Structures are given as structure tokens and as C-alpha cells.
Amino acid sequence: MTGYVVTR
């Protein structure tokens, strides 16, 4: 599973 949490 990839993580959905990002930065921006």
C-alpha cells in the first residue's frame, strides 16, 4: 500500500 499522506 502506498501512503495517501502528502505535503504541499
Added chain:
Amino acid sequence: ADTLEGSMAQLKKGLESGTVLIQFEQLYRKKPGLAITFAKLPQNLDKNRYKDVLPYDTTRVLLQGNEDYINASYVNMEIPAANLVNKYIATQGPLPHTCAQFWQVVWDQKLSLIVMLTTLTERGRTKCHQYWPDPPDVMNHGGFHIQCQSEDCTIAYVSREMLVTNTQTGEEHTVTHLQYVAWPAHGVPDDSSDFLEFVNYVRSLRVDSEPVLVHSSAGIGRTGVLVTMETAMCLTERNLPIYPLDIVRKMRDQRAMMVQTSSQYKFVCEAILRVYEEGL
């Protein structure tokens, strides 16, 4: 406390300042102290699309396929001043093996409206399984016969009518399905006016006391933006004050992380001021 006119002046000040973005960044992403256990049980782990986007135990949707599990949350937005609740079920884009559970939710509660805020694939990755058939084709999910009776589109979304047939009983249920395709993950709608148009379409399709099923890929980022905007609009028409950080907190208390990025939040705040000023 205070009024619509007043909240909007307050919101503008905070955008100009900008303290609204600071307070948003400081807001918790998960409600302090709310258990997240069922979603991490061994038999449930691979029913989540993202390891970090999980439902709270207290608000997770219970399957009347019965004592099963789905990555989905009840999300109710109360507007007490108008004696009003807008019910939602907020969920992830289903997986190939969770499709049957997704239709079970729609069937158990006879939801008539589904809002999907993602393309199926995006930037090399699969964001959602296609759980409906491309006409003429037809598909079966967990004892449900799904057919797409109708397809039409605008530049920003596709409107579909679907027929769900229980294969045991032969009972039929019709669902409207809206897929917004011009809104990249972790971003804002490609076009703000299409967005506002769309949100109004959603409100006009809403059935009272029936939850609207709303999902994107993870079911928190773009869905959160949509729930905030529909809430704001119900308030504006009733001359009630709007406090977007209270709206986001109340969502996050029912499903973690709703409205993912500061850009998404800044966007929905500007849309709220926009709708207000143009209706003044």
C-alpha cells in the same frame, strides 16, 4: 454567535492576514482519543486502499452483509439553527475485492445518490476500481447485478443512472452516480465555476434523511472539500453564519483528515466568500 455578513467579513480578514491557513494547519487531523482498531485487525487490513486512511470504530459503516467490515464512515453535518442534518457516508474508492461490500452499503440503506470525485487512474496509479459496467456490458458484485442504464457528461463530470438488481429476490434499485473527473488528487477543481455548479447539482439531487455516498480515492481530501462547500451553501441561504474551521473539525470528528491540503482549504474558503458576495 455573530452573523453571516459578520462571519464573511471575519473570513475575508483571515484570508488576507492570513490566520485562517495557520489555524487550519494547527487543527488536528485525527480526533484526539478516538479508537481506530477494527480497521487494523488482520482480517481487515487489505480492505483499506491506503494504510494511513482508516475509519474510526465509532463512526464506521456496519455492513448488513453482516459483521463484515468496510472503509467507510458516517459523517453527519448538523445545522442546528435550521433544524437540519445533511447525512453522508464517506468512503474510499473500492478495491476489486471490496466492491461487493460497497454495493451492500448502497443496497442496505437504499442510497439513491453516489458522488465519486476521482478518475479511475491518475499519474501512473490506480485510484479506484471500476465497480460499475461500461454499457452495453454488465457486471455482478456479491449477489448484485449492476447495469449502467445511461451515460451523459459535461466537461467536468459524468452523470450515470444505474440499476442494481438483487439476484436472489429480483428486487430492483436505481441509483444516480456522479463522477467528477476534473479534480486531481491532493488538488483543487480544474475549474471553480464547474465546481460550484456541481455542488448545487448534488444538493438538488439530495433526498432528505437519506445519506449521500461520497468517495474519491482515499475519501478524505476532495470529499472533505465537497462536504464543507455543501454545508456553507445551506448556511448562506438561511442567512446563518459560516465558520469553515468549525465545519472541518466537525467532519474530522467523524472521519479523520477531511480536507487534506492547505490549498484545498484555501480554495473552499474563497469559494464560500465568492458565493456569498455574488448572492448579495
